[PDB]
């Protein structure tokens, strides 16, 4: 157990760094890109990504004490349900709006005339709820089934229950393997595989166009391009692989165990997945010179 002490507290130090950098990194974006800059389609997409990360980062003190206690939940039933609703929505809202910023930036560069003619601030606010409605639809597993459970020792943990839906206790577990495989598939396919296929394609089609047309006169195009597609990869792919391998082997771990590495790595890889929320102001909003000019004249 010599090195496992690091693997236990290394999620805690990363979730604390992204808390003190999240509410300051995203709260700066809600301040000047929401109230001190004029409304643009680009600023609306940066604002909704900031609210998707700021409201998630406000729930990190509740998660950092649940992770420290070893999944023991000291809070109530209402804070168990509300925070995991707010975490899931705003994590799905963080990923789906990263893919919306990319489709915007690709239509703007690949088809420039359609953006001048059809892309506007009024159309931006009506299509921006698309990532948010898809978050509330996909978070309905949590509303319905995340309930505080008490084990006999008296510890309260926040997990799911399906005995109220199955009725019979042996075939209530048939429902339990059913939706947890349905949760793990929509986490990877809709939650990872779809916006990674949007980010890698659209930021690759942008670099295919600007290199062909010779718009590179510095290294600043290709480095911000490769920062976005790599930060969306190296933060989310350690988490979405150990959650997919978990879904592939759910029966083997629950019914018979035998796969410890999957469980030991969830707290480590989820902390790297939550570190993307403090990187999204620095990679999407802080890069532009127009935003940095408005921050120094507002402080």
């Amino acid at each position: 157990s010599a090195g496992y002490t690091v693997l236990r507290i290394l999620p805690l130090v990363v979730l604390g760094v992204t808390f003190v950098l999240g509410v300051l990194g995203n709260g700066l974006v809600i301040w000047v890109a929401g109230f001190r800059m004029t409304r643009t389609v680009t600023t609306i997409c940066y604002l909704n990504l900031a609210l998707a990360d700021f409201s998630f980062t406000a729930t990190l003190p509740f998660l950092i004490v649940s992770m420290a206690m070893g999944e023991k939940w000291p809070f109530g039933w209402f804070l168990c349900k509300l925070i995991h609703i707010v975490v899931d929505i705003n994590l799905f809202g963080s990923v789906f709006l990263i893919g919306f910023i990319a489709l915007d930036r690709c239509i703007c560069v690949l088809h420039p005339v359609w953006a001048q003619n059809h892309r506007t601030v009024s159309l931006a606010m009506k299509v921006i709820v698309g990532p948010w409605i898809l978050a509330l639809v996909l978070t309905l597993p949590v509303f319905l089934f995340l309930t505080t459970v008490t084990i006999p020792n008296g510890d309260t943990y926040c997990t799911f229950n399906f005995a109220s839906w199955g009725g019979t206790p042996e075939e209530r577990l048939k429902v339990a393997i059913t939706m947890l495989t349905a949760r793990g598939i929509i986490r990877f396919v809709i939650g990872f595989s779809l916006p990674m296929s949007i980010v890698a394609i659209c930021y690759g089609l942008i670099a295919a166009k600007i290199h062909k047309k010779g718009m590179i006169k510095s290294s600043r195009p290709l480095r911000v391009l490769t920062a976005v597609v790599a930060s969306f990869f190296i933060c989310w792919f350690p988490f979405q692989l150990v959650a997919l391998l978990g879904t592939v082997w759910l029966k083997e771990m629950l019914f018979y165990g035998k796969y410890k590495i999957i469980d030991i790595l969830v707290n480590p890889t989820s902390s790297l997945a939550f570190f993307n929320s403090c990187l999204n102001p620095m990679l999407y909003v802080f890069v532009g010179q127009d935003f940095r000019e408005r921050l120094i004249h507002s402080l």
């Binding site: 998660l63 999944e71 995991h84 975490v87 899931d88 994590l91 799905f92 995340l146 943990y157 926040c158 997990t159 799911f160 577990l173 339990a176 947890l180 949760r183 986490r187 939650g191 988490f239 979405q240 959650a243 978990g246 759910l250 629950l254 469980d263 969830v266 989820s270 997945a273």
Partner: peptide
């Protein structure tokens, strides 16, 4: 029947 709920 213990599945620590994974965030996502």
């Amino acid at each position: 029947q213990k599945f620590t709920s994974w965030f996502x």
